């Protein structure tokens, strides 16, 4: 579920938030990214990819 | 003549900081000794 303020739990990253179709392009090993300060702010769900 | 060198002067000055990316050092370093407290203070949350 997208656009909505939800709790998710991808492959043990656990966090609440607002989950969005996003435009960044990861490498085709990286699961999960994160900011200049060290937090979680994008993820690649592990059945869509 | 006075009126030509003030002119002269502010001229200069303008010049002066445009080709000095030093001259507003002041200001710079309270935006990044605020930035850099800010991001201290978030990165200070993934320590156990
Ligand atoms: C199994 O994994 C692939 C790769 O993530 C995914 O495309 C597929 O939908 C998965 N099968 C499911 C979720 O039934």
New interface residues.
Partial sequence: VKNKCVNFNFNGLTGTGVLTESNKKFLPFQQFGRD????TDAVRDPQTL | LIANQFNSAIGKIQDSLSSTPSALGKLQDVVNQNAQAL?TL??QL?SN
């Avoid at chain 1, 200049?36 to 937090?39: G, R």
């Fill in positions: 200049i300060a060290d937090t | 991001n978030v990165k993934s």
